Write an enzyme that holds these catalytic residues in place. Structure first.
Site, PDB file in Angstrom:
ATOM      1  N   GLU A 142     130.621  83.240  29.809  1.00 38.04           N
ATOM      2  CA  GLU A 142     130.955  84.173  28.866  1.00 38.04           C
ATOM      3  C   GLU A 142     132.202  84.835  28.850  1.00 38.04           C
ATOM      4  O   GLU A 142     132.777  84.902  27.786  1.00 38.04           O
ATOM      5  CB  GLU A 142     129.812  85.472  28.826  1.00 38.04           C
ATOM      6  CG  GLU A 142     129.863  86.191  28.014  1.00 38.04           C
ATOM      7  CD  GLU A 142     131.115  87.401  28.198  1.00 38.04           C
ATOM      8  OE1 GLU A 142     131.530  87.550  29.032  1.00 38.04           O
ATOM      9  OE2 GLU A 142     131.312  87.998  27.071  1.00 38.04           O
ATOM     10  N   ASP A 180     128.591  84.659  35.141  1.00 38.82           N
ATOM     11  CA  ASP A 180     129.846  84.584  35.340  1.00 38.82           C
ATOM     12  C   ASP A 180     130.397  85.794  35.666  1.00 38.82           C
ATOM     13  O   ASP A 180     129.932  86.885  35.028  1.00 38.82           O
ATOM     14  CB  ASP A 180     130.657  83.992  34.752  1.00 38.82           C
ATOM     15  CG  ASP A 180     130.905  84.297  33.375  1.00 38.82           C
ATOM     16  OD1 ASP A 180     129.910  84.492  32.779  1.00 38.82           O
ATOM     17  OD2 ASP A 180     131.752  84.187  32.633  1.00 38.82           O
TER      18      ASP A 180
HETATM   19 ZN   LIG Z   1     130.098  90.839  30.413  1.00 38.65          ZN
HETATM   20 ZN   LIG Z   2     133.680  91.047  30.983  1.00 39.57          ZN
END
Ligand SMILES: [Zn+2]
Ligand SMILES: [Zn+2]
Ligand SMILES: [Zn+2]
Ligand SMILES: [Zn+2]
Lengths: 383, 383
Positions: A142, A77
């Site tokens: 993340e 992401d």
């Molecule tokens: Zn990162």
């Molecule tokens: Zn980041």
């Protein structure tokens, strides 16, 4: 006498994953692209789905005698690009201008992820000897929640690791420790009354104010007295507030949110207990209560700066790279909750000032060099 | 041998002004109705326009030797009715059920206003002797700003008054003093930064919090040490707050509003200077400032409880009415800024608990009695 992967293909792979817009989602498209790439080179990945359209990818390559396991991790992401008219080059177009490849995710962290995948492929095709296994862990989400990092850790995919490199953008420094992060909400309940005759009410904003005063004073005392040699003091800010409904009504509701950056010397458990204590002292002798909710809770990370993994990385260079810490969290905040200790570092290509910024880019020569440096690291660590 | 005004007409006049919806506006329709009524009884009113559609009305009736001037005042606006489905009887329909006449403004304060106008007409038509002048001052916008009260005072329409009755709903008590009211806003400027690296920012919510703590502590100290025998302590509440834009950004803006109810013993000038002082102490040594704005500023009112006007009212009753104070402001906060002292009281029909409430009503017998009591008061005061 198999053909090498050419430079233009290494660059095209990175451009093609940058062009997959994966803003808090759509990571399954990036995983499918990388899994198809691995299959072209006779490495079979494992898709581990998080939710519809959001898939993690694991892949392994082993050689020699059973040995250590080295993990290579990155996330698929990216953060939103914001107003695209503000960009010089379009954020999902992956345009090359000289030595710069522009795009959201070019630095954070599709360059490191692509470099890790290509390094595995080239390691295999080089035939160079080692004794152990290198394992890719490509994660979902993340940036908002470390969703895939938590999922994979809970499932058991970190259990065999002896060492882990996370490819976030550090450029040519080794980040071995980073702060934790807590987001919290405090909600304040009161009772409405007219401002001209307020005795039957209870002012929710006042009670919230008393929390801010005490939490600020306790957190400042913690900053003044305890610190980490690399990461500094604990950080605390109230960042959002609301309350009330009309200027001549006693407010029956108020709320705030805040962010804390924590250090190992005063860990998240203690911070949350301290906040709760404050809420408790302030709720004495009233039925109109403050309430604490923890919305995000990522622990600090601290690895051994003298680990065999770090030694294997420094052995790739004629001068050692700087060891550093950082404020931002990474998926290590979830992987390090595995029930064993492993060597850890963050080391990846990118321009350190540009994660999450307009006109993000990566330097092409940095990306291509890291493909080679990862292979050297693997061969040393798994010797 | 002129005909009397019948009971049914006295009630119809009140119903017809209640049915004119005058929520923070449209007072010119109420003024025109009352001016037409006065003209039917050979009293010529003066329209004093505030803005398009919002007119004050003045009317005079004199008799005998030049003497004192008694003012009778009320306001023509009403507060909003809110959700009309919540009312038992429709708020602008002026329905009669038994001795109750239901409607927004029935108690606050179209009954007192209609009773004053009818009392003037009946005073004239009774031919009863007195020596002086009775003056109606019907105002625009008392509920939000005391707009007409200020306009008429600045223009000079209060300059000849020896005494003034305001017909707000007191039922059978005489309100001779009431609190002041201040609404204020404090705006806090800061500087954005990421929550993980906040040293280049400035937290606007924190600086606003410091204002709340100090203003609350200073206002509480003022409540604990100074009070009025009738009105009690100064009241202070922060009632609205906002701040910040994202949980992981240091907030660059925050704001609050609050309400104060003041007393003569620590007047509005001093309260505003105290708030400003606090802002000043908190802006020392920073370029990121709090700023104070005063949005509403109505002074306390305190009349002589032993005035000739009050004596003339008590002379209408076999037992004296209670002298009282109240928290809410009235147009007296503007009229008493005239450059001379006059006797003052608030005395009007209505149900004291119902101003601004759902299912507001007035008791018809109370309204009709006050038409008669006002005439007796005028005849005594202007004897
Ligand atoms: Zn990162
Ligand atoms: Zn980041
Ligand atoms: Zn009123
Ligand atoms: Zn009112």
């Amino acid at each position: 006498h198999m053909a090498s992967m050419k430079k233009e293909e290494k660059i095209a792979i990175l451009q093609e994953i940058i062009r997959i817009k994966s803003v808090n989602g759509n990571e399954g498209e990036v995983a499918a692209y990388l899994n198809k790439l691995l299959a072209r080179h006779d490495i079979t990945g494992e898709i581990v789905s998080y939710r519809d359209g959001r898939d993690n990818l694991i892949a392994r390559y082993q050689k020699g005698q059973s040995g250590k396991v080295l993990g290579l991790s990155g996330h698929m992401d990216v953060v939103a690009a914001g107003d695209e008219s503000s960009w010089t080059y379009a954020p999902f177009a992956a345009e090359i201008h000289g030595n710069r490849l522009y795009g959201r995710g070019a630095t954070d962290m599709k360059s490191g992820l692509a470099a890790m995948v290509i390094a595995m492929i080239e390691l295999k095709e080089s035939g160079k000897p080692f004794n152990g296994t290198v394992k890719l862990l490509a994660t979902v989400g993340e940036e908002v929640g470390e969703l895939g990092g938590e999922q994979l850790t809970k499932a058991g995919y970190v259990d065999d690791l002896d060492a882990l490199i996370i490819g976030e953008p550090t450029n040519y420094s080794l980040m071995y420790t980073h702060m934790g992060s807590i987001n919290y909400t405090v909600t304040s309940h009161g009772k409405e009354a007219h401002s001209s005759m307020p005795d039957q009410g209870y002012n929710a904003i006042n009670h919230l104010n008393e929390f801010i005063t005490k939490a600020n004073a306790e957190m400042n005392h913690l900053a003044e007295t305890i610190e980490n040699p690399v990461l500094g003091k604990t950080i605390h800010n109230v960042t959002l507030i609301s309350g009330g409904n009309q200027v001549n009504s006693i407010p029956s509701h108020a709320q705030l949110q805040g962010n804390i950056r924590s250090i190992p010397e005063y860990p998240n458990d203690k911070i949350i207990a301290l906040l709760q204590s404050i809420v408790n002292e302030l709720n004495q002798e009233t039925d109109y209560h403050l309430e604490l909710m923890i919305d995000y809770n990522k622990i600090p990370v601290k690895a051994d700066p003298d680990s065999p993994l770090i030694h294997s990385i420094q052995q790739q260079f004629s001068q050692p790279l700087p060891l550093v810490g950082a404020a931002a969290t990474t998926d290590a905040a979830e992987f390090t909750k595995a029930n064993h200790s492993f060597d850890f570092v963050v080391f990846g290509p990118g321009v350190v000032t540009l994660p999450h910024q307009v006109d993000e880019y990566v330097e092409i020569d940095n990306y291509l060099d890291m493909i080679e440096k990862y292979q050297g690291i693997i061969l040393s660590y798994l010797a």
